[PDB]
Design an enzyme around this catalytic site. Structure first.
Site, PDB file in Angstrom:
ATOM      1  N   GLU A 186       2.553  -0.115 -18.581  1.00 51.04           N
ATOM      2  CA  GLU A 186       1.913   1.027 -17.938  1.00 51.04           C
ATOM      3  C   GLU A 186       1.306   1.994 -18.937  1.00 51.04           C
ATOM      4  O   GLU A 186       0.157   2.451 -18.746  1.00 51.04           O
ATOM      5  CB  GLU A 186       2.906   1.724 -17.013  1.00 51.04           C
ATOM      6  CG  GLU A 186       3.358   0.834 -15.837  1.00 51.04           C
ATOM      7  CD  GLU A 186       2.296   0.629 -14.750  1.00 51.04           C
ATOM      8  OE1 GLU A 186       1.206   1.256 -14.803  1.00 51.04           O
ATOM      9  OE2 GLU A 186       2.534  -0.179 -13.822  1.00 51.04           O
ATOM     10  N   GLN A 202       9.316   6.927  -3.983  1.00 52.84           N
ATOM     11  CA  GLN A 202       8.557   5.953  -4.793  1.00 52.84           C
ATOM     12  C   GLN A 202       8.851   4.478  -4.446  1.00 52.84           C
ATOM     13  O   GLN A 202       7.923   3.664  -4.231  1.00 52.84           O
ATOM     14  CB  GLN A 202       8.647   6.273  -6.311  1.00 52.84           C
ATOM     15  CG  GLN A 202       7.586   5.539  -7.211  1.00 52.84           C
ATOM     16  CD  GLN A 202       6.196   5.604  -6.638  1.00 52.84           C
ATOM     17  OE1 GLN A 202       5.758   6.656  -6.140  1.00 52.84           O
ATOM     18  NE2 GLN A 202       5.472   4.489  -6.716  1.00 52.84           N
TER      19      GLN A 202
HETATM   20  C1  LIG Z   1      -6.221  -0.228 -10.697  1.00 52.37           C
HETATM   21  C2  LIG Z   1      -4.723  -0.081 -10.557  1.00 52.37           C
HETATM   22  O1  LIG Z   1      -4.005  -1.070 -10.362  1.00 52.37           O
HETATM   23  N1  LIG Z   1      -4.220   1.152 -10.674  1.00 52.37           N
HETATM   24  C3  LIG Z   1      -2.779   1.253 -10.836  1.00 52.37           C
HETATM   25  C4  LIG Z   1      -2.106   1.896  -9.620  1.00 52.37           C
HETATM   26  O2  LIG Z   1      -2.433   1.160  -8.448  1.00 52.37           O
HETATM   27  C5  LIG Z   1      -0.591   1.954  -9.854  1.00 52.37           C
HETATM   28  O3  LIG Z   1      -0.031   2.987  -9.070  1.00 52.37           O
HETATM   29  C6  LIG Z   1       0.421   2.525  -7.785  1.00 52.37           C
HETATM   30  O4  LIG Z   1      -0.621   2.417  -6.827  1.00 52.37           O
HETATM   31  C7  LIG Z   1      -0.164   1.883  -5.593  1.00 52.37           C
HETATM   32  C8  LIG Z   1      -1.337   1.472  -4.684  1.00 52.37           C
HETATM   33  O5  LIG Z   1      -2.221   2.549  -4.445  1.00 52.37           O
HETATM   34  C9  LIG Z   1       0.832   2.856  -4.935  1.00 52.37           C
HETATM   35  O6  LIG Z   1       1.377   2.223  -3.787  1.00 52.37           O
HETATM   36  C10 LIG Z   1       1.086   2.928  -2.558  1.00 52.37           C
HETATM   37  O7  LIG Z   1       1.877   4.084  -2.441  1.00 52.37           O
HETATM   38  C11 LIG Z   1       1.804   4.848  -1.248  1.00 52.37           C
HETATM   39  C12 LIG Z   1       3.009   5.777  -1.270  1.00 52.37           C
HETATM   40  O8  LIG Z   1       2.534   7.053  -0.956  1.00 52.37           O
HETATM   41  C13 LIG Z   1       1.868   4.052   0.058  1.00 52.37           C
HETATM   42  O9  LIG Z   1       1.217   4.821   1.062  1.00 52.37           O
HETATM   43  C14 LIG Z   1       1.252   2.657  -0.025  1.00 52.37           C
HETATM   44  O10 LIG Z   1       1.882   1.864   0.952  1.00 52.37           O
HETATM   45  C15 LIG Z   1       1.417   1.989  -1.396  1.00 52.37           C
HETATM   46  N2  LIG Z   1       0.592   0.802  -1.509  1.00 52.37           N
HETATM   47  C16 LIG Z   1       1.078  -0.339  -2.002  1.00 52.37           C
HETATM   48  C17 LIG Z   1       0.149  -1.520  -1.972  1.00 52.37           C
HETATM   49  O11 LIG Z   1       2.218  -0.461  -2.463  1.00 52.37           O
HETATM   50  C18 LIG Z   1       1.968   3.214  -5.915  1.00 52.37           C
HETATM   51  O12 LIG Z   1       2.696   4.332  -5.437  1.00 52.37           O
HETATM   52  C19 LIG Z   1       1.467   3.536  -7.327  1.00 52.37           C
HETATM   53  N3  LIG Z   1       2.551   3.564  -8.299  1.00 52.37           N
HETATM   54  C20 LIG Z   1       2.982   4.684  -8.905  1.00 52.37           C
HETATM   55  C21 LIG Z   1       4.135   4.542  -9.880  1.00 52.37           C
HETATM   56  O13 LIG Z   1       2.489   5.802  -8.697  1.00 52.37           O
HETATM   57  C22 LIG Z   1      -0.198   2.348 -11.288  1.00 52.37           C
HETATM   58  C23 LIG Z   1       1.255   1.970 -11.534  1.00 52.37           C
HETATM   59  O14 LIG Z   1       1.391   0.561 -11.559  1.00 52.37           O
HETATM   60  O15 LIG Z   1      -0.997   1.754 -12.303  1.00 52.37           O
HETATM   61  C24 LIG Z   1      -2.386   1.975 -12.127  1.00 52.37           C
HETATM   62  O16 LIG Z   1      -3.069   1.355 -13.206  1.00 52.37           O
END
Ligand SMILES: CC(=O)N[C@@H]1[C@@H](O)[C@H](O[C@@H]2O[C@H](CO)[C@@H](O[C@@H]3O[C@H](CO)[C@@H](O)[C@H](O)[C@H]3NC(C)=O)[C@H](O)[C@H]2NC(C)=O)[C@@H](CO)O[C@H]1O
Length: 159
Positions: A45, A106
């Site tokens: 990350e 989370q």
């Molecule tokens: C380009 C890319 O991959 N960017 C990365 C981020 O996607 C990633 O953060 C995580 O993003 C996901 C998807 O948007 C988040 O999950 C979502 O969270 C919300 C909770 O409020 C929920 O409504 C959705 O159901 C859920 N979607 C899925 C598919 O799970 C997630 O919370 C993010 N993670 C964090 C720790 O904030 C980050 C971390 O891997 O990396 C970016 O590069």
């Protein structure tokens, strides 16, 4: 002593931060395996860097920030600001993670393991890394087996 910057960390710098995190979360009841599974994720990350913005894009709060790349960064930064903690700070980010465990934030249970089970787990660093990837991080690309190699690396090389 920790590195906090908007720059990718070398293996030697990562190891300084990783030992720090191990020590901190050990005192708050986490297993070495669970910590190392998360470290495997933090290396991908942020190179385990609490100062790191996604793409090195400093000040873009819609994108990822910090050890686990909270996305949007505001998810974490609003919380730090509201709690009176400096947001660009190792301990502040570690306190967020403890807050999340405590408040069941989370984590989405996709692997039949809750966040509280996870921190108490003695499964392998590799297994836990994959669980943490799927349940906590959830990036667009789910295929990062490197996170498991990295977890095993930290489990072996830290005390
Ligand atoms: C380009 C890319 O991959 N960017 C990365 C981020 O996607 C990633 O953060 C995580 O993003 C996901 C998807 O948007 C988040 O999950 C979502 O969270 C919300 C909770 O409020 C929920 O409504 C959705 O159901 C859920 N979607 C899925 C598919 O799970 C997630 O919370 C993010 N993670 C964090 C720790 O904030 C980050 C971390 O891997 O990396 C970016 O590069």
């Amino acid at each position: 002593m920790v590195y906090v910057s908007n720059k990718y960390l070398t293996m030697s710098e990562m190891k300084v931060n990783a030992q720090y995190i191990l020590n901190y979360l050990s005192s708050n009841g986490w297993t070495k395996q669970a910590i190392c599974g998360m470290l495997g994720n933090m290396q991908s990350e942020s190179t385990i860097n609490p100062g790191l913005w996604q793409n090195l894009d400093e000040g873009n709060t819609s994108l990822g920030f910090g050890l686990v790349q909270w996305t949007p960064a505001s998810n974490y930064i609003n919380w730090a600001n509201s709690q009176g903690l400096p947001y660009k700070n190792m301990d502040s980010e570690l306190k967020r993670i403890i807050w999340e465990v405590n408040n069941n934030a989370q984590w989405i249970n996709l692997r039949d393991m809750t966040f509280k089970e996870y921190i108490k787990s003695t499964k392998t660093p590799r297994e836990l890394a994959m669980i943490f990837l799927a349940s906590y991080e959830r990036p667009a690309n789910p295929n990062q087996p490197e996170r498991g190699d990295q977890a095993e690396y930290w489990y072996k090389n830290l005390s």
